[PDB]
Design a protein around this ligand. Structure first.
Ligand SMILES: C=C1/C(=C\C=C(/CC)c2cccc(CCCCCC(O)(C(F)(F)F)C(F)(F)F)c2)C[C@@H](O)C[C@@H]1O
Ligand SMILES: C=C1/C(=C\C=C(/CC)c2cccc(CCCCCC(O)(C(F)(F)F)C(F)(F)F)c2)C[C@@H](O)C[C@@H]1O
Lengths: 9, 238, 238, 9
């Protein structure tokens, strides 16, 4: 889940 | 008989987050792949939902207590609840007069036939629309709408959650805020809380029917290539 | 001194495939996410390239002999060569007068500064533009352009290929067609074949620099979420 | 490579 991690700061 | 400060701060900060994450003008809809009216609408709706998932994530990070959960639970909660929060936040654009989502002129007016052209059958769209009218008839205050979205997002009964005690606690405080709010701030709301919590059970049922119909799209590479990566990650099975 | 029938049929069917896969009006560019002028251009260019990869795949399937390769080799060839074929097919829209790709009005006129706003530095765009002018100065016939694209696509020296004997054979027949074509059909072309094959070595070098700069994008989730799934699959490392 | 397979008929 690379993208959700990033979006979750 | 009177909301505490902490119960007021939870409302204040939740209302602010929704004001930051929800544009009433829908102007960013011109950055999406245009709608077309074989599944003509799938690229626009994929874009629209993908943008919405980004907004939901922004709401979530400001729900008091969410940020302090573990990254796993935050993702678990987001992954299972995203479509319910989107269905919920979409009511702000839903209109009872035309039974569509009016986010623009003829372009971003989303009839029921348009969402069919994105791969979904009436077995999802029939309950979803009726859910929207019944939610619309509640004439929720902004505080209630917001509180309901955050209560949805903090359900411990979701696949993946681990610390379903600590998010149970967060959801409990919010339910308490919503009941306090209705009791103290909404004339004639004596029955509102019960109907609202009933709407969450509706959402579960819509969520199932959506994830079933999505699974059908995501297993056909010709349609899944029209999805965005965020959509694929959030509704994917990993 | 005269092309055989089989060498004519290879030209005929290759020219037809490019006519089916390349719209000179660029009208489908209005289905892409619009260009914006933080990487403002990445969503449009991602869409543009993703569409182009679909067109390249369509060309490939009609190259005589490609369809009879194994699915592994077809993908191996497509995955390594896609950007070179896109760079190659893009010359048809390149214009020497303005040093841009003119696929529309001000919207789809792609300057060099626009591709920067999509995450690529001058170390890729400087050789790519000069490659385009030198390719443009060759004033290739349609048969040559097409033949060159298919020769690029049938390089055995690519990561993944297995039957590099049988695609070596396919590429050899095409090189023979191109030399026969230039010798018989192009006055003053006596030197053309050598310059064209020189352009393939240029493409390898552009291909490296692109894949290096792409790797940088695809490891930053904030930009890789702007890519399409096809792009992610074709330029990904799996 | 689900998508390339499909596009390759
Ligand atoms: C989003 C929002 C709006 C409308 C949502 C609307 C009505 C147009 C909706 C909301 C939930 C569900 C549905 C049916 C299935 C959707 C399809 C998704 C999808 O299944 C796809 F695209 F593939 F088909 C998925 F998930 F993959 F993207 C509609 C507009 C505005 O109020 C902002 C607000 O945020
Ligand atoms: C495609 C075509 C055209 C122009 C191509 C042009 C000039 C605008 C191009 C061609 C190759 C290379 C480059 C630089 C890097 C691109 C960026 C890609 C990418 O790195 C991104 F988007 F992420 F940045 C990738 F691959 F991921 F998509 C430009 C227009 C028309 O002639 C049709 C024809 O087919």
């Amino acid at each position: 889940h690379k993208i959700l991690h990033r979006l979750l700061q | 008989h009177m909301l505490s400060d902490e119960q007021m701060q939870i409302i204040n900060s939740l209302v602010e987050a929704h004001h930051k994450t929800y544009d009433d003008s829908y102007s960013d809809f011109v950055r999406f792949r245009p709608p077309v009216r074989r599944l003509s609408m799938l690229p626009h709706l994929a874009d629209l939902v993908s943008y919405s998932i980004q907004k939901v994530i922004g709401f979530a990070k400001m729900i008091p207590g969410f940020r302090d959960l573990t990254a796993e639970d935050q993702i678990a909660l987001l992954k299972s609840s995203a479509i319910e929060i989107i269905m919920l936040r979409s009511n702000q654009s839903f209109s009872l007069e035309d039974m569509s989502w009016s986010c623009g002129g003829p372009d971003f007016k989303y009839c029921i036939n348009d969402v069919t052209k994105a791969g979904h059958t009436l077995e999802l769209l029939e309950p979803l629309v009726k859910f929207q009218v019944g939610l619309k008839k509640l004439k929720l205050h902004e505080e209630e709408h917001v509180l309901l979205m955050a209560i949805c997002l903090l359900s411990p009964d979701r696949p993946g959650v681990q610390d379903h005690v600590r998010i149970e606690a967060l959801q409990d405080r919010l339910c308490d805020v919503l009941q306090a709010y209705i009791r103290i701030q909404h004339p004639g709301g004596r029955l509102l809380y019960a109907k609202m919590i009933q709407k969450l059970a509706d959402l579960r049922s819509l969520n199932e029917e959506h994830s079933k119909q999505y699974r059908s799209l995501s297993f056909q590479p010709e349609h899944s290539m029209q999805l965005t990566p965020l959509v694929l990650e959030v509704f994917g099975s990993e």
